[PDB]
Symmetry: T
Subunit: 118 residues, 12 copies
Amino acid sequence: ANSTVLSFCAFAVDPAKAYKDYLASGGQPITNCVKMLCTHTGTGQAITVTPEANMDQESFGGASCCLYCRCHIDHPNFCDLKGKYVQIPTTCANDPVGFTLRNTVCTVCGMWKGYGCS
Amino acid sequence: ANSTVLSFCAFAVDPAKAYKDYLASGGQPITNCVKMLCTHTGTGQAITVTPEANMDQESFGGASCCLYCRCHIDHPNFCDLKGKYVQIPTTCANDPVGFTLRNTVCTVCGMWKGYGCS
Amino acid sequence: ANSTVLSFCAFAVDPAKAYKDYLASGGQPITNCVKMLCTHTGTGQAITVTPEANMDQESFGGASCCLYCRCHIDHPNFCDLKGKYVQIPTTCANDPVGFTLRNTVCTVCGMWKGYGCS
Amino acid sequence: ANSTVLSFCAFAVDPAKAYKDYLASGGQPITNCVKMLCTHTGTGQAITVTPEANMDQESFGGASCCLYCRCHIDHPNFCDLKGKYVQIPTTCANDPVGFTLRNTVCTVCGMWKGYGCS
Amino acid sequence: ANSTVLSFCAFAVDPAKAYKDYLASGGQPITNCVKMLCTHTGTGQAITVTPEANMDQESFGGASCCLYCRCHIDHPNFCDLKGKYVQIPTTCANDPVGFTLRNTVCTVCGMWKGYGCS
Amino acid sequence: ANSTVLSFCAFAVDPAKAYKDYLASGGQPITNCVKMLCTHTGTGQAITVTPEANMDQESFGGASCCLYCRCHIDHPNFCDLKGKYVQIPTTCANDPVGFTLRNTVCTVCGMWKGYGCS
Amino acid sequence: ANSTVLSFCAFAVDPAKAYKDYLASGGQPITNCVKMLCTHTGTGQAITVTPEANMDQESFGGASCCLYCRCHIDHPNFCDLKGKYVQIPTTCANDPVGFTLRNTVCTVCGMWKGYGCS
Amino acid sequence: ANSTVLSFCAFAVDPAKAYKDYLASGGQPITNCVKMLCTHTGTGQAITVTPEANMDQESFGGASCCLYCRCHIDHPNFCDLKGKYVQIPTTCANDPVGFTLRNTVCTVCGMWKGYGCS
Amino acid sequence: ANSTVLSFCAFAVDPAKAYKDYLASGGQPITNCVKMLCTHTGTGQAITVTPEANMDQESFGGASCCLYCRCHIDHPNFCDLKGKYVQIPTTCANDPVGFTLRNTVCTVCGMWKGYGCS
Amino acid sequence: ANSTVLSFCAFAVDPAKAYKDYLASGGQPITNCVKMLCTHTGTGQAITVTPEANMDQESFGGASCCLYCRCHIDHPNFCDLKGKYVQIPTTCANDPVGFTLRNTVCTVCGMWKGYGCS
Amino acid sequence: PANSTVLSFCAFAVDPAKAYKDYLASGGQPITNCVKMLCTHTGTGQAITVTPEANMDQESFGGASCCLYCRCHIDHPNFCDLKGKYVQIPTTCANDPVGFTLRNTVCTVCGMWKGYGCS
Amino acid sequence: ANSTVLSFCAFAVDPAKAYKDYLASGGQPITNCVKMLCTTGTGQAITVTPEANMDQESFGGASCCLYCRCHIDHPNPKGFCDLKGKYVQIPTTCANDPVGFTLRNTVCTVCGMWKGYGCS
Ligand SMILES: [Zn+2]
Ligand SMILES: [Zn+2]
Ligand SMILES: [Zn+2]
Ligand SMILES: [Zn+2]
Ligand SMILES: [Zn+2]
Ligand SMILES: [Zn+2]
Ligand SMILES: [Zn+2]
Ligand SMILES: [Zn+2]
Ligand SMILES: [Zn+2]
Ligand SMILES: [Zn+2]
Ligand SMILES: [Zn+2]
Ligand SMILES: [Zn+2]
Ligand SMILES: [Zn+2]
Ligand SMILES: [Zn+2]
Ligand SMILES: [Zn+2]
Ligand SMILES: [Zn+2]
Ligand SMILES: [Zn+2]
Ligand SMILES: [Zn+2]
Ligand SMILES: [Zn+2]
Ligand SMILES: [Zn+2]
Ligand SMILES: [Zn+2]
Ligand SMILES: [Zn+2]
Ligand SMILES: [Zn+2]
Ligand SMILES: [Zn+2]
């Protein structure tokens, strides 16, 4: 499943939009991101140097979520995710990749705009 | 003409301010940016991996607008423009190099603050 | 479609050959090659640092026609097209990617052999 | 004093959180940041390519204040400070390193949030 | 915390030996290693590109364990752990760093000699 | 042919595991591995700087056999094969890519464990 | 044999010219160029990404024929041979190194000028 | 002198054409290229690894004639002149820079097309 | 005045000589070299890792004074001034760029010859 | 003597084999490897970060032993010896460059198989 | 160990070298564990060389083991203009190699230590 | 000739010394150093442009960097072989052996000229 999806997006002139369109067609989210095991809740920050999932999130290994790293192609913006950990609201933890693609980290508090910001 | 302006800004201890003051004295906007021939049905985002100009914008070539890339010098952010496409509000496509400098991209929208944002 | 073709050529031992075979079987050429907005009174040369299309050509962004560049793989000849602009005969413009693969630039006049040369 | 603190934060899994706790527990701010000798008539923006302190600020050599550059370790995000100059409210010029970690630069204003912004 | 131990070793002319000697003297093992969720019984191999823990092991993040990566110093061998995932026996898992150091991976089995091999 | 398979592995989170399963499901082995013209009087060592096939082996160009170099993706461990030559037991020469993946090169004899060591 | 000639060439101010003069002094050609086991039904072009020899040529591992790659020195070309395969007229397979040095690939058809061209 | 012209061309979106129009207007050619003392006489090739001047040519330092090199900007071609020696027809030794730009080296004999080829 | 001078010296075959001549014609020295506000309790050495000015000198940011760094071009010798701090005799603080060009650091005491040496 | 051998092996398609055949023909071992003046109280491991020789060994500088490093050519393993120290049984210390080529380190105990191992 | 304390100190100092200087000035113990070479001791006697060149009045140490910066795992201000090379040191000062290379200079003419060889 | 000498130094543990004894044994100096065609220069030992004077020859920097001729890394106190890309002025009376001349001489840090040939 992931190969068809990742293949389709990898060669599209715009990977991000290929995925977006794909999901909009009812396509299945990219699975197999790595979930981090935490013994304590963290700051709840979007992207961090160490796992920081709080009561409402889950922490995945950065690269594991970066679509470009997953598609093995160059970056738009290096995975400003690679080597770090991404916190995702649990309600959206079903599509980590798509999530970071569709959201914005707050520059002030550093949490997802719309989910735990301000 | 471009050479006189760019030569001027290129050796300034602060290029951006140089161009800013240059224009402030009635100077003429740097020209020769490359315009993309698109359908104008884009997302309207400020900076994108492919032309995404809507009906009130023009799509220029990244490097064409990055002052530093034009001055062949280092950056103070790499041409977060280079290799991408900048959408500029039609009413401001007479000074692309200047537009990007003067304006901010809404981190939430992806659109230019004050021109499309919200 | 594009992904389909691009994927097939991407992993073939000889990408260029796979695209030729593909075409020779009536496959649709690769699309989404960005086109430049230029005067059309250029030198008409095959590959240039700024759009140089004459009346019988179309200018495209070099990278968007570089099959390797498109596929995200190394090169045979980096593809001498990236960062430059390719001028293509309007009649052949319907397949930029293949056109550059099947043709040759004159070392002497810099135009496509058979479409501008001598 | 400085070496004790820096050593402690460097080998931490999260240097920023370490330093933050060190201070919280009544630790003395990292000293030895280089202060620039300016006119104090500058724009007053947070991080600039040339000293821009105003009357209520002090200008420091970027690197001097980047905790990561002081610890000799890789970076989160290189020192988006290395090479630039950091303007800091005089009331806070006693802990430049920590000030830049606790505060955020307005992407529109270019000035410190809560310290000049808007 | 872990920083006093890491500081010692980082400046030793032989970190690996320093940490061993440290532990020998009753020193506390280095903590703060990251664990990941293994999606259904792994092969049990010691070092993999994806979590691969057995029902007897736990999967830690490579770099998180490589002592040289924790001490921010170059390597002997780079972190044939970095970017990968290290599987460690649950009952030896209180000292991830030490374990990888004290043990050898079978070049045949791919499992730890003494803990899985043959 | 190879594109379907290769495309399927390149995007899996564990290419090797994927190719393995593919083969398990009866999939056809990857082909088109450049085969060398040797005398078959060589050392008979697994991986070497020049073709060294003995009477029981065939020689191939390293890269034609490294799944990673064939999928145009990065390496776990560069192709310990790239640039060198891989000796493959003739009976197993119909699946060179797979062979190198399942076998272990003896640190002493220098030959594949089970197919020529001791 | 080879060590003597290559050593001689490698330090000359013009390695190519040195080999040429050598040969003309009745010098023995450089031997030990990897020979490919090919179908002998290839396009027949000079330098290819895969063995393309025809019924009148042999296919050698490029790098084994690049004098500079053989002398371990820099290039005046970058071994547009290294990594590729060189098809050489069987009646000349006795001096693959010298052939490429002496001959020229036609830019239009890609075949050795005067050995298959036009 | 040379600064007025080199600066002018340096910032032009098409440096080559700039120097061309400059000359077309009676502008003085870029001077100050280094001349190599080529006692005896070389092969007469256009671009060589050591001076090869004829009775009818002068040998200049590769860099000295590389417009991009003399301008300190990137290239459309490093310039294949740098570290090389260029042989130019005595009658044209008054504008080395512009010469290389206006002329072409024969791929077969290595000599300037029109000025030595055949 | 800076961009005019820098421009002139940047395209000269010898920046340093060009600036020297520029000065000998009553040309105004390059300005805008950042200075450090220190305690003037330094060793008074020529080039240091931290401000070391004594009562008779000013401390400048190395890069501000490295003519090439200011001219944005390669270097004869790695700006040995870049990242460092240059001490300059007060009575010469009016032409920092030039000072470092005209003077030499004693290899024994690390001070400017004829300004604190021996 | 050294330069002859090294030169001989340097240009060999298979250097290691070349040096082997050289020795086998009663050739004199490469000399001038650097011995470490240490107290022979080390762990006696094959390759280490600090001299580790025991009473029955000699410690040499890694690089001075790596044939490829002595030949200035690339590698097949880089110089997993360079920067470290190699312990060679005293009774073999007359041929350091060879001993490492001919022997294997135990992946478990870390000593030379057949000279300390187990 | 012993050196880790003094090295941890200098490493984070704004001027590592100066920090080590102050350390010794306070009676601190010189850094140890510099690797020593076994050579002819009839060498050129030059300061920094590509192969051991100690004479009868010197000792040859392994550059890197003597470059404080390389020892503190931090970037350099002078890579080690010593790394890969060998350092000849007056036998009388062989007790503090790391400090010696900091406090002394090299005859740009004779390649020998100013004060111990030159002229 | 050149190849023999260079091959000999190229693999020596100390190229500079290898060549030193080679010459000592009456060996012949390395040849083929691009001689520059120049005017009235400063006469400074190493420059970015031919700066020879009436008593020197200006050669191409690399042509004289032994290491740069043997194809091996360089010992020069951390860096680049400070000749490559530049131009070396050598006293005409010694131009018969440029490679060795630089090896045997020192450039005055103050006046930028060869110690013994123009310095002070
Ligand atoms: Zn990424
Ligand atoms: Zn917020
Ligand atoms: Zn830019
Ligand atoms: Zn918005
Ligand atoms: Zn390409
Ligand atoms: Zn033509
Ligand atoms: Zn930083
Ligand atoms: Zn604001
Ligand atoms: Zn590591
Ligand atoms: Zn096993
Ligand atoms: Zn590979
Ligand atoms: Zn074996
Ligand atoms: Zn080559
Ligand atoms: Zn042809
Ligand atoms: Zn160039
Ligand atoms: Zn011709
Ligand atoms: Zn510089
Ligand atoms: Zn002095
Ligand atoms: Zn090596
Ligand atoms: Zn063992
Ligand atoms: Zn160092
Ligand atoms: Zn002296
Ligand atoms: Zn060199
Ligand atoms: Zn002098």
